[PDB]
Amino acid sequence: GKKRKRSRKESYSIYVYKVLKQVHPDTGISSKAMGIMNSFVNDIFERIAGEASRLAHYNKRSTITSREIQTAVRLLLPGELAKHAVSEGTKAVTKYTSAK
DNA sequence: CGTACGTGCGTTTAAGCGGTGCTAGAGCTGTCTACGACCAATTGAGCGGCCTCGGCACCGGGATTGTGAAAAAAAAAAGCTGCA
Numbered sequence: 001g002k003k004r005k006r007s008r009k010e011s012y013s014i015y016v017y018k019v020l021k022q023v024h025p026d027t028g029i030s031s032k033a034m035g036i037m038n039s040f041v042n043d044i045f046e047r048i049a050g051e052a053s054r055l056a057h058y059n060k061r062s063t064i065t066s067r068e069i070q071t072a073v074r075l076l077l078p079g080e081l082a083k084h085a086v087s088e089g090t091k092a093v094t095k096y097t098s099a100k
Numbered sequence: 101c102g103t104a105c106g107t108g109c110g111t112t113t114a115a116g117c118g119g120t121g122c123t124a125g126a127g128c129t130g131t132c133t134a135c136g137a138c139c140a141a142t143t144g145a146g147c148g149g150c151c152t153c154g155g156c157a158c159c160g161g162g163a164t165t166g167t168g169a170a171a172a173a174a175a176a177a178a179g180c181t182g183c184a
């Protein structure tokens with residue numbers, strides 16, 4: 001083998017895979033398709049975060065809470081997508097708090 | 101070529117003005133603490149490296165689809181005959 005480790009490069013791909021095997025267990029994903037799924041996750045991270053950042057800033061608050069994320073989500077996603085995304089985020093917070 | 105629009109009348113209507121009267125609720129001050137930054141030790145999830153092996157890229161060949169020309173079936177539209 002050869003010396004010097006290539007420098008770390010973060011991605012979401014192991015989590016895209018994991019979600020992929022829930023939804024379509026007998027289905028894989030190409031190299032460039034994963035590059036797209038990455039570019040997607042990063043896009044929506046940025047959009048949501050930015051809007052929450054602004055919401056917090058408008059109402060004179062230092063802290064982004066799950067509340068901000070929800071409001072941003074309601075502003076950014078279309079109708080049905082927002083509902084489900086609001087449900088799942090709520091579920092996730094509810095579940096996380098009670099498992100402390 | 102047909103009539104949907106623009107024009108210019110009168111007729112009707114409620115927008116706007118100025119004023120008064122109430123109070124929801126914006127928006128502030130002060131007190132308290134739960135909740136997040138911070139740190140340090142801990143230590144597994146996630147990384148880069150690497151090796152298999154089955155899906156996809158590609159090929160050839162046959163089956164199917166689809167276009168288009170020119171040749172039928174049919175419809176149609178005029179000229180010809182008789183016609184109560």
Ligand SMILES: [Ca+2]
Pocket residue numbers: none
């Ligand atoms: Ca890997």
